[PDB]
């Protein structure tokens, strides 16, 4: 029984543009979702709170 909020699949997607074994799969996917949420929480907090050159929008 995986927690809800950890089901499905998630991944970070980074882009540059010129513009304006059954349970093993489930537990690996949920752990990957947890780590992607950890990454994006770190990134979004550093974007909002840390003062940097040419600021970002979250």
């Amino acid at each position: 029984q995986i927690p809800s909020d950890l089901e499905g699949s998630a991944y970070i997607k980074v882009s540059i543009q010129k513009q304006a074994p059954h349970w093993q799969t489930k537990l690996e996917a949920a752990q990957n979702v947890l780590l992607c949420k950890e990454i994006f929480a770190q990134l979004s907090r550093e974007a909002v709170q840390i003062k940097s050159q040419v600021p970002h929008i979250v």
């Binding site: 927690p3 809800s4 909020d5 950890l6 089901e7 499905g8």
Partner: protein, 48 residues
């Protein structure tokens, strides 16, 4: 009078509600009974 065959709540956010529905079917069935009762009050029903 009217029967309330299916009531559904369309308001959804998949983050505050932790990847699940915003309102459990228990509470939806409760509101089903409440609006069915106020339909049985037999006023102008659809405004209520």
């Amino acid at each position: 009078p009217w029967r309330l065959l299916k009531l559904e709540i369309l308001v959804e956010d998949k983050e505050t509600g932790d990847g699940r529905a915003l309102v459990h079917s228990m509470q939806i069935s409760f509101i089903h009974q409440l609006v069915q009762s106020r339909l049985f009050a037999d006023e102008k029903p659809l405004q209520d």
